[PDB]
Design a protein around this nucleic acid. Structure first.
Length: 187
RNA sequence: UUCAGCGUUCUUCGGAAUGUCGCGCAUUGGCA
C-alpha cells in the first residue's frame, strides 16, 4: 500500500508541476529569436550555423561515443549537460583515468564491466571498420535474400502489472521487488 | 430366278502451359 501512496503523491507533483514565478518566467520572453534548432525547435538558446542548439549537437556527437567507449564521465568538461554544473563525456579507460585524476569531482560509470551501469549497445556493423562506415547499409549487403532492413519494436506485456501485482501479496517485500526488476534490467 | 442394299462406327487418346524476372534507381534515410 505505502508504495502506492508514494505513487499517489507523484501524480500530485505532475499536476501542479510549476510555481507561478516559474510560469511567469516562461511567459516573459523578451526577444522572439531569429533562428531555431532543427531538432529541439527552440530559439532562446543560441543556434549554430547547422541549425543545431548546443544540447542537440552534443547529443548527436555523443551518440557514436556511447556505443564505442565503455566509460561514462560526469566531469566539469564534457559533451552533454548534466544536473549540477557538470557534463557527460563518453571516454575510454585512459581518458577516464586522465579526467578523474585531473579534477577530483569526476564521476565514472562503466559500461557492461567507478559505478557499473548496464546498457545494451550491440552493433554488428562495429565489428569491422568498413562495416562500421557502412552502418545499416552493411546489413542489406546480402549475396542471397531480399536486401531489406527489419525493425523490431517490442514491449514486455503487462510490465506495469508485473511491477504492481507480479509478486503475490504473500511474497511482497523490498528484496524481491528489487531482484525482479534487476533481473529484468539485466536481461 | 429376279428385286434390293442393309446394319455399325461419326472422331479417339495424350499433352492443357512452363521457365525466367516479381520492381529498380534518384531525392529521403544511413555513414561521415
Amino acid at each position: 500500500d505505502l508504495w502506492q501512496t508514494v505513487s499517489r503523491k507523484l501524480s500530485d507533483k505532475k499536476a501542479h508541476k510549476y510555481s507561478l514565478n516559474e510560469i511567469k518566467l516562461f511567459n516573459s520572453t523578451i526577444h522572439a529569436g531569429t533562428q531555431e534548432c532543427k531538432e529541439c525547435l527552440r530559439s532562446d538558446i543560441d543556434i549554430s550555423e547547422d541549425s543545431l542548439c548546443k544540447i542537440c549537437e552534443g547529443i548527436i556527437a555523443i551518440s557514436n561515443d556511447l556505443r564505442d567507449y565503455s566509460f561514462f564521465v560526469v566531469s566539469p568538461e564534457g559533451k552533454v549537460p548534466l544536473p549540477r554544473n557538470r557534463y557527460l563525456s563518453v571516454e575510454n579507460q585512459d581518458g577516464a583515468e586522465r579526467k578523474i585524476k585531473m579534477n577530483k569531482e569526476t564521476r565514472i560509470y562503466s559500461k557492461n564491466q567507478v559505478t557499473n551501469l548496464w546498457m545494451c549497445d550491440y552493433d554488428f556493423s562495429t565489428l569491422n571498420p568498413e562495416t562500421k562506415k557502412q552502418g545499416i547499409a552493411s546489413y542489406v549487403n546480402r549475396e542471397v535474400g531480399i536486401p531489406r532492413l527489419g525493425v523490431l519494436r517490442a514491449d514486455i506485456d503487462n510490465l506495469g502489472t508485473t511491477f504492481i501485482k507480479g509478486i503475490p501479496e504473500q511474497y511482497r517485500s523490498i528484496s524481491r521487488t528489487a531482484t525482479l526488476s534487476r533481473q529484468l534490467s539485466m536481461f
